[PDB]
């Protein structure tokens, strides 16, 4: 064989080049920095009304409005300050697995096992929330819808590929292929130039929204990756797999920056998010709880202890004032 | 605060509609249709009347939502937990493919799929309604092809009844939570229109069993 040998040697020499020039690990430089102690957060608000498993949530761009998707086919927009239900949207498919809040607040795109990303318009003249458009073209379940602007959105799927859409036309503008497993998460860069998607093939990939080319590939996990998010500066990203290991990779170093695992945790990570400063990486775990890791010292500097079921989703506001967590016990809790 | 006082009222109305929707949704039966593809689940779907296909039907004032996920073509480990809470799992197995092969024959495919589903961690308190398709074709085929081709340890006459009973028992032995969950076997009929009645009886028994487990006498 020729292609197999060529691919093997390319991988071998690129890995050798990456390892040989690596200077030192993250801890070797960040050891001298004092820790943060214990991040003690208390439930300021508890949002009730979902009557099934909560699978996703997304913060509004104003750090006050929230959208949450539940397994009973309900999409609820909450007022986070006063726990008022701003909107209630009946989904056509009850098997919703992800969804997001538009950066302008006018739209919400949401979907799941129905192979469709349904997009709903909030600021209508009719006083309700109408379905703006159904984006179809995926042959596997849908994950991590994320609006770029009012008319452009990227979605990952179980088709081993991601898709950049055009909501005005409804056609798949760009297709990103190359994964060898179910792509379970994606996260948009802050500057709307790149994004990263983690798949069930235990790898993440950095893709360009305008060129559609495989810019980077990132390995290091042993099982499927469930969640991914960008560092706020757009030069790093954190993944969480079923291995129960959270890993921080650098987009430019091409090597994992740090591991965020501990011996006591056996169940994998369900959701991952950062604080505004990029100092507190929050990770919602499979057992019952959420861990607040010090994203520089890899120490559990705080635990959110509620959520009598599996914590499915996390979210941090743009200003960082609060953190909303959704779990499988049908309860959204806001921590500050 | 007048605007806030109206917003609280709007949220209260929204919450009461949510409560009503939950009350309505808790009063319906959820079935997860599973099979090996060549097991003729389409026949079951027809007798009841891409991605996930929902079939809604009413029988004896009981509402049934049956979810077919045969057109997913993805790793079940990522979305099977979404069905934790279904009333029952309707499994379909063909009896004609005991000799036909897909390497390995399709009957072992169906048996190991059944073993995987029945012993799933998300499926411990959920019952399985097992359907055996191609009754006439299986009866006619064994007159020339012995069941020994599939099961080498089988010892019995190549008749429909003994072979079918052996196959049912072999499927039964795959269960490991013999006291937690229960397996409900049926042989599919064409013109009798009894499959829906069997599903109704099975789901009724499941509901009664859950009520008894709740009460504390049982």
């Amino acid at each position, epitope marked *: 064989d020729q292609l197999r040998q060529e691919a093997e040697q390319l991988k071998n020499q690129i890995r050798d080049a990456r390892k040989a020039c690596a200077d030192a690990t993250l801890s070797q430089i960040t050891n001298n920095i004092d820790p943060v102690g214990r991040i003690q957060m208390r439930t300021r608000r508890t949002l009730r009304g979902h009557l099934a498993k909560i699978y996703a949530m997304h913060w509004g761009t104003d750090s*006050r*409005l929230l959208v949450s998707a539940s397994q009973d086919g309900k999409l609820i927009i909450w*007022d986070s*300050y006063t726990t*008022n239900k*701003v*909107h209630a949207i009946p989904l056509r498919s009850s098997w919703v697995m992800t969804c997001a809040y538009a950066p302008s*607040g006018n739209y919400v795109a949401c979907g799941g096992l129905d192979n469709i990303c349904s997009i709903y318009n909030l600021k209508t*003249r*009719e*006083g*309700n929330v109408r379905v703006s458009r159904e984006l179809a073209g995926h042959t596997g379940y849908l994950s991590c819808c994320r609006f770029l602007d009012d008319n452009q959105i990227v979605t990952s799927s179980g088709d081993t590929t991601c898709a950049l859409w055009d909501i005005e036309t409804g056609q798949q503008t760009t297709t990103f292929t190359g994964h060898t497993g179910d792509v379970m998460s994606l996260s948009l860069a802050p500057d709307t130039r790149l994004f990263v998607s983690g798949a069930c093939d235990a790898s993440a990939k950095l893709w360009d929204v305008r060129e559609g080319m495989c810019r980077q590939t990132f390995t290091g996990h042993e099982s499927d990756i469930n969640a991914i998010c960008f560092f706020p500066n757009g030069n790093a990203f954190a993944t969480g797999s079923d291995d129960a290991t959270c890993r921080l990779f650098d987009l430019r170093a091409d090597q994992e920056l740090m591991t965020y695992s501990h011996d006591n945790i056996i169940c994998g990570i369900t959701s991952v998010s950062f604080s505004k400063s990029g100092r507190l990486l929050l990770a919602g775990y499979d057992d019952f709880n959420c861990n607040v890791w010090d994203a520089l010292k890899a120490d559990r500097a705080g635990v959110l202890a509620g959520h009598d079921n599996r914590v499915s989703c996390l979210g941090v506001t743009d200003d960082g004032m609060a953190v909303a967590t959704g779990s499988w016990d049908s309860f959204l809790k806001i921590w500050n | *605060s*007048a*605007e*806030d*006082k*109206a*917003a609280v*009222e*709007r949220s209260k*109305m929204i919450d009461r509609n949510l409560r009503e929707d939950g009350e309505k949704a808790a009063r319906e039966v959820k079935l997860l249709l599973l099979g090996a593809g060549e097991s003729g689940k389409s026949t079951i779907v027809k007798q009841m009347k891409t991605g996930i296909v929902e079939t809604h039907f009413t029988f004896k004032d009981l509402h049934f939502k049956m979810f077919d996920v045969g057109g997913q073509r993805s790793e079940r480990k990522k979305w099977i937990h979404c069905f934790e809470g279904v009333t029952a799992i309707i499994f379909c197995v063909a009896l004609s493919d005991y000799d036909l092969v897909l390497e390995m024959n399709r009957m072992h495919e169906s048996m190991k799929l059944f073993d995987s589903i029945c012993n799933n961690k998300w499926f411990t308190d959920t019952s399985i309604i097992l359907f055996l398709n191609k009754k006439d074709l299986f009866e006619e085929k064994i007159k020339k092809s012995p069941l020994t081709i599939c099961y080498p340890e089988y010892a019995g006459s190549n008749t429909y009844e003994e072979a079918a009973a052996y196959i049912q028992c072999q499927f039964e032995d795959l269960n490991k939570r013999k006291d937690t969950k229960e397996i409900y076997t049926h042989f599919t009929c064409a013109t009798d229109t009894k499959n829906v009645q069997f599903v109704f009886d099975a789901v009724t028994d499941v509901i009664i069993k859950n009520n008894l487990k709740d009460c504390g006498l049982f």
Partner: single-chain antibody
Amino acid sequence: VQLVESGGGLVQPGGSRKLSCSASGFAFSSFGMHWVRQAPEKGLEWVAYISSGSGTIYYADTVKGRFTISRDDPKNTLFLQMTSLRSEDTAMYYCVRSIYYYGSSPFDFWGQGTTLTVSSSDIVMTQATSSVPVTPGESVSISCRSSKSLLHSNGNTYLYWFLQRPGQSPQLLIYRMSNLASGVPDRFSGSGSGTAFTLTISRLEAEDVGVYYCMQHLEYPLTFGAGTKLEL
């Protein structure tokens, strides 16, 4: 969206009438509804309010207990049943929608109104003048003052700026301080502090003439300003 009123006409004192407001073009069941009135060449004056689901009902203290508010959600019809009519009830009545959640504009759409002729504590909002002449292309600033500080503890100041062109219905321009309504050109702006409030108009065109009104919500009853008429 189309709200159409009916029931107007001429009535004798001591009688009872009924005003109907038919909605067509939006979700009437999800909108609270206000009845407002405007006396001939005098100014606007709020009448009544009914929340979504007919839960909360508010009447103006001057007429409280003498009018009645009814709602038909399966039919999308608003009823104002008026029991006894003096010589002051003669006016043009408007049927306004109002939806209340975080960020909504609760005075967006107004009805066309219906006329009624009868034969013969509360916050005070005062507007500076009643007639200001100006030419197109010149920025105009209108001001009005309140008694209480409308700035609530929420941080929101419940001030509303409306415009009524000659022969037309009122149209919302500002709903808290500087939040432009839907379909209003970006030349208008609003500002102020606590009690003193200013509406500024840059690059004024010929269609911007009419009577401007400043209103406060903040509490019931809702009180309107005098109404400053721009002249050209």
